[PDB]
């Protein structure tokens, strides 16, 4: 092909931060920016993501009060659940559980997911248990885009592309003034940069 793209670089700084730079070359003048801006807006806004949207501690002392034998408050564990990264392709509403029954660290690896969801980083700490409590919590997971607004709601955001950039460079044809586009994508491991570029 004349017009060609390649994955010029990729990195995996963590299970929760991939990076990828892509090239697309022999673009014509004014094509590269029309591509770049639309692709940026697609990546940053029109990519969908999967995350936990609701939590239900199966024993609740009070809606706002502390929880016994956990080394941090219900709010800290709800924030740690907010930071969970999920990999699902199927839309719709889904459910999950944590049932950890002793002292130790509860982590994303301990989440019992439905068949259609995958943990992106098993190692993500969720909660510290000092006491041998049969801590059971239900979770409800949704796939959507952007953001959305008794069991706790989680103020989670469905945006797996963590950042994106593009640069436009003269290819140097003195008449046709062709151009090179570079795109850069940082993502949660919910998508690889290439998969986010395709879905965008």
């Amino acid at each position: 092909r004349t017009l060609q793209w390649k994955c010029v670089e990729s990195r995996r700084d963590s299970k929760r931060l991939y990076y990828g730079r892509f090239i697309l070359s022999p673009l014509m003048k004014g094509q590269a920016d029309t591509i770049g801006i639309a692709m940026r807006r697609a990546l940053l806004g029109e990519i969908e993501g999967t995350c936990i949207t609701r939590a239900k501690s199966e024993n609740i002392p009070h809606d706002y009060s502390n929880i016994v034998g956990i080394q941090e408050s219900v709010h800290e564990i709800l924030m740690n659940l907010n930071e969970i990264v999920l990999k699902s392709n199927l839309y719709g509403t889904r459910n999950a559980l944590i049932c950890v029954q002793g002292p130790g660290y509860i982590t994303a690896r301990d989440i019992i997911l439905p068949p259609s969801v995958e943990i992106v980083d098993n190692t993500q700490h969720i909660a510290t248990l000092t006491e041998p409590i049969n801590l059971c919590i239900g979770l409800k997971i949704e796939r959507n885009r952007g953001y959305s607004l008794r069991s706790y709601p989680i103020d989670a955001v469905f945006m797996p592309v963590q950042n994106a950039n593009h640069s436009i460079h003269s290819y140097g044809n003195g008449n046709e003034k062709q151009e090179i586009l570079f795109i850069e994508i940082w993502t949660n491991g919910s998508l690889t940069p290439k998969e986010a570029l395709h879905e965008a």
Binding site: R1, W5, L24, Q31, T34, A38, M39, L197, H198, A200
Partner: peptide, 17 residues
């Protein structure tokens, strides 16, 4: 619309092995 689609399809180009 068609020219936009012609700009974005290139990212879905697979190439032969």
């Amino acid at each position: 619309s068609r020219n936009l689609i012609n700009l974005f399809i290139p990212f879905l180009h697979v190439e032969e092995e």
